[PDB]
């Protein structure tokens with residue numbers, strides 16, 4: 001044809017010869033089954049005997065086991081090998097979902113539908129499925145008429161927007177390394193392609209990527225180019241489909257990374273880009289006269305990334321600034337602040353014997369940082385070692401070396417955070433051009449899933465709270481669609497909103513004197529500590545809220561913990577150490593004041609404009625800003641039609657084609673996929689329009705099938721015969737106004753009788 005000529009088609013759908021070979025395997029619906037297996041998650045076997053509540057099974061490895069029947073899962077026939085939408089399987093169970101995804105992944109078919117979910121398993125290699133010619137194949141095509149692909153989901157959202165006159169959202173989730181960033185970039189490019197009719201808006205949208213990834217992405221153990229911030233990117237269009245504008249919102253930037261690197265990790269890419277040989281004189285202008293290995297804040301672990309050329313990356317970043325209309329002075333002032341950060345991390349201090357007051361231990365690095373900030377080194381060091389506190393008089397407050405080091409790290413994190421916020425805001429101004437009406441938008445949300453670590457803190461609480469909200473959002477969306485379908489089919493049975501399954505945990509976190517409220521209140525109580533917070537939380541909730549628990553003893557390498565919560569993804573042990581400090585984000589106000597007075601670095605003055613000093617003043621916690629931000633995100637998502645992309649990391653080795661079955665099953669458990677298949681299975685997983693049912697099953701009831709001119713009455717007549725024959729129960733189906741609805745396993749049984757009689 002023409003589809004089959006494109007190189008991407010072999011990575012989208014098997015040939016007829018590969019399919020017939022897939023379907024050419026021995027199979028007995030009553031013999032071949034799946035059993036639990038520690039290594040492989042599930043293992044194929046054959047029932048050789050059955051005895052009451054038990055079954056004897058020879059597994060694929062040859063051994064013989066005896067199991068309770070409740071552990072045995074039905075295996076799908078080979079005609080369902082590599083099925084494109086798993087809600088079509090005859091048997092909707094965990095073992096079959098795992099098998100189908102693994103079979104597709106082995107053939108580098110990385111996209112699979114699962115009803116409302118689009119699952120994508122990271123290929124860890126280049127696939128030719130994202131080219132212009134591949135994208136054009138999906139434009140205007142019915143999603144059900146094309147193989148699974150990110151572009152089919154994207155094009156359906158775009159057509160929905162135009163035909164339904166409603167905003168859309170694309171929610172992309174998954175663990176670190178699963179593929180979120182890559183999918184997000186390709187979605188944005190697809191929308192910029194379909195919405196495009198001497199520097200175009202589309203060009204500038206794309207150029208945000210090098211800038212935002214230089215300052216917001218870093219090498220981690222899990223991912224060489226890990227985005228350390230969540231993001232919501234809205235692509236605005238007029239009512240004719242024309243690209244109009246784009247805006248970006250960022251969430252939870254990882255601030256600790258600019259002062260600390262764990263083994264195997266790097267700081268944000270930008271420091272190594274600036275230092276690279278792309279612009280050799282830049283190091284000299286920035287007074288970066290030591291090897292990069294000697295700058296403590298960026299050199300605690302790795303300095304290079306296998307496969308990444310920081311020279312070429314910096315060229316792309318430096319050019320992107322220009323394309324995005326940053327001025328030469330803005331760009332240089334930005335680079336100077338990055339230099340200042342590296343110099344600050346190398347400043348040393350000491351105390352003389354029996355002195356509590358820190359003094360500089362040499363001043364060369366402080367002078368270089370001050371030069372980058374455009375301020376005097378003496379006032380900078382005085383602000384740092386002897387800050388002033390208003391109490392109606394300015395008093396000087398002494399600092400020891402521990403306090404100075406704390407203050408330097410806090411300043412460096414808060415200054416970097418504000419540079420990043422400024423880069424986003426500047427991008428947003430560039431991308432907001434005159435010309436095209438902003439009638440609708442599609443919002444792309446890319447943020448990490450649940451995080452359950454050995455040690456869970458304030459940052460994990462917020463990301464897990466976010467994901468409770470997002471999973472409830474999915475559950476509610478699924479519930480509304482089911483309810484609306486039954487309603488218009490005249491089959492309404494009354495069921496409770498699936499989103500209520502997450503509401504108790506959400507309330508524990510978000511209600512008055514729930515977790516966040518108690519933190520906000522305690523953070524301002526004189527003499528309060530992390531321990532008084534924790535006792536208050538236990539006092540308010542333990543034994544009164546079922547999702548609040550005392551934590552298990554530190555098994556394995558779990559740290560100490562003050563309380564535990566039962567999240568959607570499991571039980572999380574939280575440690576409240578430093579939560580009061582994290583919630584207030586205190587800075588050295590005297591240092592900020594000196595920076596806001598700088599005459600040598602206008603960008604430095606700009607990025608502190610959101611901060612009010614003591615002198616300017618003469619309360620908003622972090623969680624209050626986060627709560628407002630999340631509430632605004634959710635209010636907006638609930639005024640859109642959402643689409644769901646679930647990225648899966650296949651293994652821990654960045655190995656293409658290899659599946660770690662335990663790791664994959666765990667993600668499918670925690671990301672809603674397996675629970676969605678269960679909920680599907682327990683309802684009416686299958687629906688067939690009356691005419692197609694009549695043609696499908698006439699042979700089982702040929703007189704009934706032709707008994708009436710009205711196709712609905714013919715379908716009813718067939719079903720009445722099956723119920724009369726005993727080969728169907730009235731409970732197993734429902735006749736709708738336009739479709740027949742089938743409980744789990746009922747359609748397959750009807751296929752069995754149809755094939756037998758055939």
Ligand SMILES: Nc1ncnc2c1ncn2[C@@H]1O[C@H](COP(=O)(O)OP(=O)(O)O)[C@@H](O)[C@H]1O
Nearest residue numbers: 122124125175176177178179180181182223225
């Ligand atoms: N669809 C894909 N095609 C090619 N490579 C991919 C794809 N998805 C992920 N990768 C690879 O895996 C790495 C991690 O993916 P990424 O999207 O950065 O994960 P996440 O953003 O979820 O942390 C990428 O840098 C890239 O090498």
